[PDB]
Design an enzyme around this catalytic site. Structure first.
Site, PDB file in Angstrom:
ATOM      1  N   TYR A  57       0.813  -1.164  -0.071  1.00 53.66           N
ATOM      2  CA  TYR A  57       0.009   0.089  -0.231  1.00 53.66           C
ATOM      3  C   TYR A  57       0.896   1.267   0.089  1.00 53.66           C
ATOM      4  CZ  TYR A  57       1.092   0.576   5.018  1.00 53.66           C
ATOM      5  OH  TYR A  57       1.475   0.827   6.200  1.00 53.66           O
ATOM      6  N   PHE A  96       1.303  10.136   5.156  1.00 57.47           N
ATOM      7  CA  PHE A  96       1.769   9.560   6.193  1.00 57.47           C
ATOM      8  C   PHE A  96       2.579   8.225   6.429  1.00 57.47           C
ATOM      9  CE2 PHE A  96      -0.500   6.250   8.689  1.00 57.47           C
ATOM     10  CZ  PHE A  96      -1.253   5.762   7.669  1.00 57.47           C
ATOM     11  N   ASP A  97       2.560   7.453   5.377  1.00 51.89           N
ATOM     12  CA  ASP A  97       2.942   6.243   5.381  1.00 51.89           C
ATOM     13  C   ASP A  97       3.180   5.834   3.698  1.00 51.89           C
ATOM     14  OD1 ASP A  97       3.646   3.309   5.597  1.00 51.89           O
ATOM     15  OD2 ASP A  97       2.556   3.505   7.555  1.00 51.89           O
ATOM     16  N   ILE A 111      -4.868  -2.146  12.490  1.00 50.24           N
ATOM     17  CA  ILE A 111      -6.181  -1.590  12.472  1.00 50.24           C
ATOM     18  C   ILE A 111      -7.229  -2.479  11.693  1.00 50.24           C
ATOM     19  CG2 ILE A 111      -5.509   0.659  13.365  1.00 50.24           C
ATOM     20  CD1 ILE A 111      -6.096   1.682  10.377  1.00 50.24           C
ATOM     21  N   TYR A 149      -6.569   5.147  14.751  1.00 49.94           N
ATOM     22  CA  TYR A 149      -6.167   5.578  16.006  1.00 49.94           C
ATOM     23  C   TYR A 149      -7.047   6.380  16.738  1.00 49.94           C
ATOM     24  CZ  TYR A 149      -1.755   3.905  14.250  1.00 49.94           C
ATOM     25  OH  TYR A 149      -0.777   3.010  13.813  1.00 49.94           O
ATOM     26  N   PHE A 192      -5.792   4.933   2.046  1.00 49.52           N
ATOM     27  CA  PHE A 192      -4.580   4.019   1.662  1.00 49.52           C
ATOM     28  C   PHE A 192      -4.980   3.437   0.164  1.00 49.52           C
ATOM     29  CE2 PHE A 192      -5.108   3.312   6.166  1.00 49.52           C
ATOM     30  CZ  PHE A 192      -3.994   3.628   6.628  1.00 49.52           C
TER      31      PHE A 192
END
Lengths: 48, 72, 107, 175, 451, 241, 327, 54
Positions: C26, C36-37, C56, C82, C99
């Site tokens: 992803y 963020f990722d 999650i 979160y 994502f």
């Protein structure tokens, strides 16, 4: 010892008092005096 | 410092002190372009020094005091 | 919930089973287009079996809602993400996540 | 001529060092050492006797001029505290053991090498320090060390004064 | 010839790097007058080092220690805990993971490596690290911010007792006794009233060693008796630790010094004379075992103070004004156990008649000064009069300082211990099996009156 | 130790009075007690007393001379001008440490710095501008930043003085409520932590978040190292906690 | 208050794209990727190239001191903070930062130091603390570890040669955290080490030729920012034992038959001394390993002499005190 | 294997190995740390500030 004066947390009248302490004040300010000699001329004479 | 009233109050002699650091005739004049315990003569140029506070009292451009309104 | 959206789906039916490493590659995103990722920059396809609660449950539910070779735009929410706690230093409170999920293999 | 060559190479070896402030370094390090017995000042004083090593007038006057210029109270204060800190025989520890010296030797050897050659200027300045606000008598200090040596060795005799012979530890502690 | 040819190869000034470094560093210092004193420091360091290649070898052989291939797992756990705790001392390192310090200490206690191997924990400076962490905990007085020095438990109850394998482990703690001189700490991680658990460090350091108890010195002990003189204060309330905030059980300050000094004077068998002399000399200048009320001093007499503290002990609690709670409370104690440990130490100090010295080697002055304190013959009344271990101290005193008429005033070691020991080996709910050792120990106190 | 002395008739024969001069190096010690201490105390006493809504020219208010005074204090407490040689620079640092500690045993922790903070009585210099003459809070910045600089320089300079601001941390919070002299706070912090932490052991969220709100009104101080990283790490020699 | 400023003469570009535009339908194409570093920051934003900041000196100190703050919070072992940080400063930013040639020296060395301070600051630190132990196990691998590989007593090479030393180990984690600081310091995530190991060789072989020519323009400003951050990262990666004997032979081929003979500044010599220090560490480790290799057969053969002329101690007859013990 | 041969060679290194064969370094290193061979076009021949003086 040395003719110490107590510290200035009480600057009003208690600094007029006297105490003796041969500790770290023996280098420092409160254990210091001066020979304010009465004579004007030759005041830097060798005191006897 | 009024030393005349030496008995009623003290005079502070230390602030009154002065020192003869240098002294020359007026002809000793070079402007940058000693002897050792020499004597002191009238008319010769004199240099003073306030002892513990090393501020050489000397010819400065002091035009601040107007008590007399023409005076340095 | 995981409002899945397809991008370039493959067979469309090879859904993941229990104990199956979703080899996910992803690129995690937030709202506003603030990244963020990412797994593509790592060249390390993310791996996770189903049910063990590593990730999650956005990933778990979306993967379960996803076939093999399915490039998809997942959309997690603060309840599954979160939330009001937030992964500190990176994620703030009350965040909706995105994502660019692309499941590849299952081992 | 062999001895002459030995002295010439000695002085050349010393000139390799004290021409580069080796003696100034020696006095600086002694002054920094404020009356603590340690191996750093031990190596200093070994170096000092090494540069001296026969009463070199050059390192003598260099040391003296440096001291007069600096007016360092810490050097003679350090020598005072050192001689106060020097050790003695401690015959109680010897008694319990029946079941520090070379430091002082090199200290007093350095102090000797100052005044060697009848160098009167050290012999005064090591007494007076006339150019400085305060004064210290090094000579009195070595004399006091000699008294503290005397009382210990006298008690050491009085221990074995009643006995018949002395063991190897005893003669070593004597020597 | 094997060793010799190896030495010739090692002493070849073996192995290009050397000539390269020696020419390039001197060229560097040559070609310019260089600032940055750390650079020239490192340059001359490497220059000295490449000549003195042996110097790298001398300070490596004490540190390196060989093991077998089997011990290469628990040792790596030990190395991991040690690198962890090196990242818990100062360098990248300290305190706030107190759990990790405690847990590394627990893993290091439970490790099985120095049990088998003679010299690892000493060479690695584990003791240095633990003591460093303790000072980093402490810093100064008035606080004891971290009241969990299990470092004390580590050093005392493991390091000084692993020295059965290598007695020089205790030598290091005897060297750090020089630090306990300045780290004379008053704080206890035990029952914890006031009683100086790092005194256990010194106690374990000089517990049983003639050489090290002989290497003791008077300034190690002058301060201790000064602290005991500081113990000479009255007892007013339940636990005046320094004010009795809420909790009241019992203050104890003087005892643990006496417990240490017992180990200090008393060797394995017979006690020590070089120490006990100066000890009693210093005690007589300032003998401040001040009980409730006696002549001259406060106390300096056992029976009156003990009976007054027994009035305090039995019907009240440890305190005087409190509602009847005291039994096996080792304010009762610090007034009974204080004199108990005192007389234990004193009986341990002095010699016996018909010993190596039968009162003919200047032991007569000290034996008389002991005998000038009589109440000493009167301690048989104490020897009948909770704790049966207090009377062990006074019977030891009578044994060591003190004809069959004196046996026969009592007729026995004591009739009540005899009956109570004959009867306490019959199992019952109460008054039984508390004294399964509390009075079965009294063979140790009663047999030696054989003679 | 407290042997108070009285001019007895005879008293003790063994009461000899040995002496110890202000020696050659202590000419400066003899100087400062007269020069920088007593006069500065009187000046700031008059100025502080007149900060309390007292009539202006009746008692000491020589604002030109208090300005020149604190200027002379700051020039006298100046650093040693790093370009100089090793020896004279270290001797200037010796002299700086000596005058600093002589001020200290004269009462920096209790008198002098207390008078600096007790002179910092400014609700707002603009509001005070039209109360007492025409000037109250002009060089408040100068006194605050510079005498707090020599304060932290003392704390640095003798290696266990962590006394006033690390000790009386309420007077550090008396800076953090104002937030103009963020220049010397780090000067306390970074010299405190190489010695021992006392300032950092009690600071909390309420200080750091206020500092962050201040940072939003800021472009990265350029000693952001020496304030915000030394808040954490102390420049490579670190306390863990 | 700023003003929206109308005349902004500053860095344009030097390379757009290798686009191509063919006919037959007006085909266009480009198979040549390019990336660049933006700048958009929550408490104050300004979208520009990072190379745009070499002119203006009011954000360089901002970004530089923030890089130092980032390396400060991740200092001396603090791994939760690195896991949070690596979201912000993911690896290809770092890789482009080290590999670019036009960037300023401040942010260059700051990015490098920050990489070291979340990558090579606790493992390398730890094994440096345990480097001076030389704890040995006794294995058959610890017997073919002799002083020389050859009978000629040739000088050997330090980095090559077997260690057989219980050095502590290296472990890792991932950015989306689980078990964030238990034992994970290869990186806070996993870092690709071998590409960096190739890139440092590439950049050192670049910088030797960049500095050999006495160039007006080094990478960032001057030669110190060129060589210092590169060489300190090389030092961190050398002491970890990641480098192989081919890499180490190439490293010697730089400098043995070089970098040392070159003119260099003083803080570069500062780091070359540490390189030589680690070489001497490797040599000394090889020395005592060979000594232990001797000591095995020596203690065996020598206690065999006691076993030859069997001699004994008190009544527990034939104890191992005859071999090795006193008590 | 055991530590005993390591401390054997420790005691052996001081006696049988350490001697003038490498403690001749003292005069040589000072002969080589004194010179300061440079040609800086102001010295007489060399010795800008020699390594030992630095």
């Amino acid at each position: 010892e040395c003719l110490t004066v107590p510290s200035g947390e009480h600057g009003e009248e208690q600094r007029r008092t006297v105490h003796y302490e041969g500790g770290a004040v023996s280098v420092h300010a409160r254990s210091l005096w001066r020979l304010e000699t009465l004579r004007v001329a030759w005041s830097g004479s060798h005191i006897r | 410092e009024s030393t005349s009233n030496s008995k009623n109050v003290p005079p502070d002699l230390s602030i009154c002190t002065f020192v003869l650091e240098q002294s020359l005739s007026v002809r000793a004049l070079q402007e940058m372009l000693g002897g050792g315990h020499r004597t002191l003569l009238y008319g010769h140029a004199i240099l003073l020094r306030h002892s513990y506070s090393g501020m050489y009292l000397c010819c400065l451009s002091t035009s601040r005091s107007s008590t007399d309104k023409l005076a340095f | 919930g995981v409002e899945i959206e397809t991008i370039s789906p493959g067979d469309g039916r090879t859904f993941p089973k229990k104990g199956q490493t979703c080899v996910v590659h992803y690129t995690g995103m937030l709202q506003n287009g603030k990244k963020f990722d990412s797994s593509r920059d790592r060249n390390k396809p993310f791996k996770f079996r189903i049910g063990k609660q590593e990730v999650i449950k956005g990933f778990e539910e979306g993967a379960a809602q996803m076939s093999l070779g399915q490039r998809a735009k997942l959309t997690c929410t603060p309840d599954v993400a979160y939330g009001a706690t937030g992964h500190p230093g990176v994620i703030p409170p009350n965040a909706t996540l995105i994502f660019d999920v692309e499941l590849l293999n299952l081992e | 001529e062999e001895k002459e060559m030995e002295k010439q190479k000695l002085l050349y070896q010393q000139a390799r060092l004290h021409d580069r402030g080796a003696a100034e370094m020696v006095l600086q390090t002694i002054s920094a050492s404020k009356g603590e017995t340690g191996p750093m000042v031990a190596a200093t004083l070994k170096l000092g006797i090494a540069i001296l090593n026969g009463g070199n007038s050059t390192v003598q006057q260099k040391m003296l001029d440096y001291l007069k210029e600096k007016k360092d109270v810490g050097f003679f204060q350090s020598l005072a505290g050192l001689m106060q800190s020097c050790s003695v025989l401690d015959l109680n520890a010897f008694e319990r053991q029946n079941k520090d010296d070379e430091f002082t030797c090199d200290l007093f050897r350095f102090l000797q090498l100052l005044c060697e050659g009848h160098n009167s200027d050290f012999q005064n300045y090591l007494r007076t320090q006339t150019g400085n606000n305060t004064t210290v008598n090094i000579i009195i200090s070595t004399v006091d060390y000699l008294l503290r040596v005397q009382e210990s060795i006298s008690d050491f005799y009085w221990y074995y004064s009643g006995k018949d012979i002395i063991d190897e530890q005893g003669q070593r502690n004597f020597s | 010839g094997r060793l010799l040819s190896l030495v010739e190869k090692v002493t070849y000034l073996k192995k290009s790097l050397q000539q390269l470094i020696s020419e390039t560093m001197v060229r560097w210092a040559q070609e310019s007058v260089i600032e940055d004193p750390e650079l020239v420091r490192a340059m001359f360091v490497l220059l000295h080092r490449q000549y003195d290649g042996i110097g790298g070898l001398v300070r490596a052989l004490p540190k390196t220690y060989t093991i077998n291939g089997v011990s290469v797992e628990d040792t790596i756990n030990l190395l991991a805990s040690l690198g962890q705790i090196r990242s818990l001392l100062s360098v990248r390192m300290g305190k706030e993971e107190e759990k990790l310090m405690i847990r590394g200490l627990g893993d290091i206690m439970n490790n099985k490596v120095f049990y088998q191997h003679p010299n690892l924990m000493r060479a690695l400076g584990m003791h240095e690290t633990v003591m460093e962490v303790m000072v980093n905990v402490l810093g100064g007085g008035e606080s004891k911010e971290i009241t969990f020095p299990k470092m004390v438990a580590n050093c005392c109850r493991f390091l000084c007792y692993f020295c059965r394998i290598s007695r020089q482990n205790q030598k290091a703690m005897f060297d750090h006794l020089s630090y306990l001189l300045e780290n004379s700490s008053v704080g206890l991680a035990s029952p914890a009233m006031r009683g100086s658990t790092p005194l256990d460090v010194a106690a374990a350091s000089v517990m049983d060693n003639n050489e090290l108890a002989l290497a003791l010195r008077e300034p190690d002990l002058e301060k201790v008796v000064r602290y005991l003189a500081g113990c000479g204060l009255q007892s007013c309330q339940m636990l005046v630790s320094k004010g009795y905030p809420d909790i009241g059980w019992n203050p104890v300050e003087g005892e643990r010094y006496l417990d240490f000094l017992r180990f200090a004077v008393f060797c394995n068998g017979e006690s020590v004379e070089e120490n006990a002399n100066v000890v009693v000399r210093l005690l007589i200048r300032r003998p401040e075992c001040f009980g409730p009320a006696l002549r001259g001093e406060g106390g300096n007499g056992l029976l009156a103070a003990m009976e007054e503290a027994i009035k305090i002990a039995e019907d009240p609690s440890r305190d005087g004004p409190s509602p009847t709670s005291g039994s096996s409370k080792t304010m009762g104690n610090a007034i009974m156990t204080f004199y108990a440990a005192l007389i234990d130490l004193l009986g341990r100090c002095a010699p016996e008649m018909h010993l190596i010295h039968a009162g003919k080697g200047e032991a007569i002055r000290i034996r008389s000064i002991l005998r000038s304190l009589g109440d000493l013959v009167g301690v048989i009344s104490i020897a009948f009069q909770f704790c049966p271990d207090h009377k062990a101290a006074m019977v030891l005193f009578l044994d060591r300082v003190y004809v069959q008429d004196f046996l026969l005033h009592l007729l026995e070691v004591g009739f009540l211990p005899d009956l109570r020991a004959a009867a306490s080996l019959d199992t019952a709910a109460l008054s039984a099996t508390d004294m399964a050792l509390a009075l079965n120990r009294y063979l140790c106190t009663a047999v030696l009156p054989l003679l | 130790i407290q042997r108070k002395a009285i001019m007895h008739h005879e008293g003790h024969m063994d009461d000899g009075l040995n002496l110890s001069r202000s020696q050659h190096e202590e000419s400066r010690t003899a100087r400062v007690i007269r020069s920088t201490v007593f006069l500065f105390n009187r000046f700031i006493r008059g100025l502080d007393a007149l900060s309390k809504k007292v009539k202006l020219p009746t008692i000491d208010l020589p604002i030109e001379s208090v300005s020149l005074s604190l200027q002379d204090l700051i020039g006298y407490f100046h650093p040693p001008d790093e370009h100089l040689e090793h020896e004279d620079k270290q001797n200037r640092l010796r002299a700086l440490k000596n005058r600093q500690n002589l001020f200290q045993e004269e009462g920096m922790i209790n008198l002098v710095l207390e008078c600096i903070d007790r002179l910092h009585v400014y609700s707002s210099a603009a509001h005070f501008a039209d109360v007492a003459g025409r000037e109250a809070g002009e060089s408040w910045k100068s006194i605050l930043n510079s005498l707090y600089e020599l304060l932290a320089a003392l704390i640095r300079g003798n290696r266990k003085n962590c006394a006033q601001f690390s000790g009386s941390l309420d007077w550090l919070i008396s800076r953090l409520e104002r937030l103009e002299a963020s220049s010397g706070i780090l000067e306390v912090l970074h010299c405190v932590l190489v010695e021992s932490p006392e300032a950092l052991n009690i600071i909390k969220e309420g200080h750091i978040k206020s500092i962050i709100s201040l940072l939003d009104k800021h472009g990265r101080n350029h000693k952001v190292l020496d304030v915000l990283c030394s808040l954490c790490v102390c420049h490579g020699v670190a306390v863990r906690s | 208050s700023h003003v929206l400023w109308s005349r902004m003469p500053n860095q344009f570009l030097k390379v757009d794209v290798s686009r191509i535009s063919e006919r037959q339908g007006w085909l266009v194409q480009c198979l040549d990727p390019l990336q660049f570093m933006s700048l958009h920051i929550p408490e104050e934003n300004r979208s520009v190239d990072i190379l745009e900041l070499t002119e203006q000196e009011e954000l360089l100190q901002f970004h530089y001191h923030t890089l130092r703050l980032y390396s400060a919070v991740c200092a001396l072992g603090n791994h939760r903070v690195a896991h949070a940080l690596c979201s912000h400063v993911d690896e290809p930013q770092l890789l482009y930062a080290i590999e670019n040639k036009y960037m300023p020296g401040l942010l260059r060395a700051g990015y490098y130091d920050l990489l070291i301070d979340i990558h090579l600051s606790s493992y390398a630190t730890a094994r440096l603390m345990m480097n001076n132990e030389f704890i040995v196990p006794m294995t058959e691998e610890t017997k073919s570890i002799t002083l020389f590989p050859d009978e000629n007593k040739k000088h050997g090479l330090p980095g090559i040669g077997l260690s057989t030393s219980l050095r502590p180990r290296m472990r890792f984690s991932s950015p989306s955290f689980v078990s964030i600081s238990n034992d994970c310091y290869q990186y806070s995530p996993e870092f690709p080490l071998d590409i960096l190991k190739a890139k440092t060789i590439q950049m050192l072989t670049e910088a030797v030729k960049e500095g050999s020519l006495h160039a007006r323009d080094p990478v960032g400003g001057t030669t110190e920012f060129l060589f210092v951050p590169l060489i300190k990262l090389f030092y961190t990666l050398l002491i970890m034992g990641i480098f192989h004997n081919e890499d180490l032979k190439h490293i010697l081929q730089l400098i043995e038959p070089g970098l040392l003979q070159m003119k260099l500044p003083e803080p570069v010599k500062l780091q070359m001394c540490l390189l030589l220090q680690y070489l001497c560490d490797c040599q000394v480790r090889h020395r005592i390993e060979a000594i232990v290799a001797f000591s095995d057969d020596f203690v065996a053969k020598l206690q065999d002499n006691q076993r030859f002329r069997y001699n004994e101690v008190m009544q527990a007859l034939n104890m191992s005190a005859a071999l090795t013990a006193r008590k | 294997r055991h530590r005993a041969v390591n401390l054997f060679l420790q005691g052996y290194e001081k006696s049988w190995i350490e001697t003038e064969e490498h403690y001749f370094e003292d005069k040589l290193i000072e002969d080589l740390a004194k010179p300061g061979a440079e040609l800086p076009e102001e010295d007489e021949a060399m010795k800008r500030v020699d390594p030992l003086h630095q």
